Design an enzyme around this catalytic site. Structure first.
Site, PDB file in Angstrom:
ATOM      1  N   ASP A  67       4.460   1.392   5.581  1.00 48.71           N
ATOM      2  CA  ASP A  67       5.724   0.797   5.955  1.00 48.71           C
ATOM      3  C   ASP A  67       6.733   1.839   6.272  1.00 48.71           C
ATOM      4  O   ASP A  67       6.913   2.800   5.541  1.00 48.71           O
ATOM      5  CB  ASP A  67       6.292  -0.189   4.861  1.00 48.71           C
ATOM      6  N   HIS A  69       9.563  -0.135   8.061  1.00 48.27           N
ATOM      7  CA  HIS A  69      10.643  -1.329   7.886  1.00 48.27           C
ATOM      8  C   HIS A  69      12.122  -0.893   8.159  1.00 48.27           C
ATOM      9  O   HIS A  69      13.015  -1.113   7.286  1.00 48.27           O
ATOM     10  CB  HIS A  69      10.808  -1.888   6.446  1.00 48.27           C
ATOM     11  N   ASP A  96       4.392  -2.923   9.143  1.00 44.62           N
ATOM     12  CA  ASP A  96       5.724  -3.172   8.635  1.00 44.62           C
ATOM     13  C   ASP A  96       6.694  -2.212   9.255  1.00 44.62           C
ATOM     14  O   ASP A  96       7.306  -1.402   8.616  1.00 44.62           O
ATOM     15  CB  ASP A  96       5.635  -3.052   7.146  1.00 44.62           C
ATOM     16  N   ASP A  99      11.740  -5.346   9.957  1.00 47.90           N
ATOM     17  CA  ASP A  99      12.280  -6.114   8.919  1.00 47.90           C
ATOM     18  C   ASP A  99      12.952  -5.412   7.823  1.00 47.90           C
ATOM     19  O   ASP A  99      12.458  -4.296   7.389  1.00 47.90           O
ATOM     20  CB  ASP A  99      11.362  -7.068   8.386  1.00 47.90           C
ATOM     21  N   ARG A 100      14.056  -6.037   7.324  1.00 50.03           N
ATOM     22  CA  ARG A 100      14.709  -5.555   6.137  1.00 50.03           C
ATOM     23  C   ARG A 100      15.675  -4.355   6.442  1.00 50.03           C
ATOM     24  O   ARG A 100      16.825  -4.292   5.978  1.00 50.03           O
ATOM     25  CB  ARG A 100      13.667  -5.162   5.029  1.00 50.03           C
ATOM     26  N   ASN A 128       2.201  -7.276   8.028  1.00 52.08           N
ATOM     27  CA  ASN A 128       2.580  -8.651   7.929  1.00 52.08           C
ATOM     28  C   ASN A 128       4.037  -8.857   8.463  1.00 52.08           C
ATOM     29  O   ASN A 128       4.471 -10.041   8.805  1.00 52.08           O
ATOM     30  CB  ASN A 128       2.371  -9.211   6.532  1.00 52.08           C
ATOM     31  N   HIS A 129       4.833  -7.800   8.606  1.00 55.58           N
ATOM     32  CA  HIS A 129       6.212  -8.142   9.222  1.00 55.58           C
ATOM     33  C   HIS A 129       6.198  -8.209  10.860  1.00 55.58           C
ATOM     34  O   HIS A 129       6.989  -8.942  11.470  1.00 55.58           O
ATOM     35  CB  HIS A 129       7.420  -7.424   8.616  1.00 55.58           C
ATOM     36  N   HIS A 177      -3.210  -2.869   6.597  1.00 57.00           N
ATOM     37  CA  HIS A 177      -1.819  -2.891   6.108  1.00 57.00           C
ATOM     38  C   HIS A 177      -1.782  -3.436   4.734  1.00 57.00           C
ATOM     39  O   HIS A 177      -1.150  -2.909   3.947  1.00 57.00           O
ATOM     40  CB  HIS A 177      -0.933  -3.864   6.934  1.00 57.00           C
ATOM     41  N   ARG A 225       2.130 -13.390  -4.111  1.00 59.81           N
ATOM     42  CA  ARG A 225       3.086 -13.610  -3.030  1.00 59.81           C
ATOM     43  C   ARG A 225       2.920 -15.030  -2.333  1.00 59.81           C
ATOM     44  O   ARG A 225       3.539 -15.345  -1.259  1.00 59.81           O
ATOM     45  CB  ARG A 225       3.193 -12.436  -1.998  1.00 59.81           C
ATOM     46  N   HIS A 252       1.938  -1.812   2.183  1.00 61.89           N
ATOM     47  CA  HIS A 252       2.345  -3.194   1.886  1.00 61.89           C
ATOM     48  C   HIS A 252       3.214  -3.326   0.584  1.00 61.89           C
ATOM     49  O   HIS A 252       4.178  -4.066   0.424  1.00 61.89           O
ATOM     50  CB  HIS A 252       1.013  -3.957   1.902  1.00 61.89           C
TER      51      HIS A 252
HETATM   52 ZN   LIG Z   1       3.770  -5.778   4.072  1.00 60.86          ZN
HETATM   53 ZN   LIG Z   2       6.353  -3.905   3.482  1.00 65.64          ZN
END
Ligand SMILES: [Zn+2]
Ligand SMILES: [Zn+2]
Length: 315
Positions: A67, A69, A96, A99-100, A128-129, A177, A225, A252
């Site tokens: 990540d 992100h 990733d 995001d965020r 996954n993002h 990931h 999750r 992740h």
């Molecule tokens: Zn992730």
């Molecule tokens: Zn992440």
């Protein structure tokens, strides 16, 4: 518009130095550049196998980061410490990217620009993002909408949807990931034929790769999750045997030192977004594997200053 520009509609190393400077200075790349690179890479990515297979010859090395992100300044920090991407300094970014963070647009187009510039040496694997859902809630979409338009967002989406799901190196080391599988007996030949161009389903292998976590105790648990599961050290050891692999690198989850080694050596987590979300104090790192000893070396680094835009700002 005195901003950075493609030479002959096609990315170049000095466009990139240029995009990086421009982005350091909080300016925006022009829509039509944004647009060109996004279509170009849709193209490149989209003839890619779902399972990327790469070969480090004896004297090459490749860096694998997890990540990031939207922490773009820490992305630049990566490059300053370890070098720019180039055919002799190849990168994998294990998803990733968005995001965020509040500089996701900066992240992603730097990312796609190097993909365009070094297609066989700079690898992007889906997080996954890179999916509509995470995108509607964690910031990417708000971010794109604010700097471009919805249109430019759906284009991003369509692009992500071509991002390979996983990459194996010397048929020894496999990188994705999230992780391994909800069900057993999954092989590399399976990952290859995953028809990846979609939002991931609820469950099945493509979910897992994007979503699952290791756990310490043997077995499988439902994932804390809401999707995929936690796989144990048996799970990992079972999958390495069927497939003939040395071990797996995945991302992740954040880590106070920027890596963990679980599963007895067998399942490594690198995570390269430090002080994740300006909160967690964490270290990040990245990993150097080299052609003749594919064993991870872990390189730590920590977060630099970035400008005063808040995490999440665009959600
Ligand atoms: Zn992730
Ligand atoms: Zn992440």
């Amino acid at each position: 518009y005195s901003g950075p520009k493609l030479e002959d509609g096609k990315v170049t190393i000095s466009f990139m130095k240029e995009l990086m400077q421009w982005y350091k200075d909080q300016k925006k790349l022009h829509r039509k550049c944004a647009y060109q690179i996004l279509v170009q890479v849709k193209e490149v990515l989209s003839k890619l196998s779902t399972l990327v297979e790469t070969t480090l010859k004896e004297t090459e090395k490749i860096t694998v980061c997890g990540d990031t992100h939207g922490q773009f300044y820490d992305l630049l920090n990566i490059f300053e410490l370890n070098g720019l991407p180039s055919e002799t300094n190849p990168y994998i970014f294990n998803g990733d990217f968005v995001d965020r963070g509040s500089f996701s647009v900066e992240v992603i187009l730097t990312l796609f620009g190097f993909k365009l510039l070094y297609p066989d040496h700079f690898h992007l694997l889906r997080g996954n993002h890179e999916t509509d859902n995470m995108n509607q809630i964690y910031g990417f979409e708000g971010e794109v909408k604010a700097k471009y338009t919805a249109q430019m967002y759906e284009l991003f989406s369509e692009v992500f949807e071509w991002l390979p799901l996983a990459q194996c190196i010397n048929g020894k080391v496999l990188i994705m990931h999230g992780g391994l599988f909800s069900e057993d007996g999954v092989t590399l030949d399976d990952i290859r034929k995953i028809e990846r161009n979609r939002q991931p389903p609820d469950s099945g292998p493509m979910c897992d790769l994007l979503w699952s976590d290791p756990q310490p105790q043997n077995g499988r648990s439902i994932s804390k999750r809401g999707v995929s599961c936690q796989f144990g050290p048996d799970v990992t050891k079972a999958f390495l045997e069927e497939n003939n692999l040395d071990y797996i690198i995945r991302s992740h989850e954040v880590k106070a030192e920027g890596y963990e080694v679980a599963h007895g050596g067998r399942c490594v987590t690198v995570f390269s977004a430090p002080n994740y979300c300006d909160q967690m104090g964490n270290k990040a790192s990245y990993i150097h594997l080299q052609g003749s000893d594919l064993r991870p070396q872990f390189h730590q680094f920590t977060a630099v200053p970035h400008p005063n835009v808040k995490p999440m700002a665009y959600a």
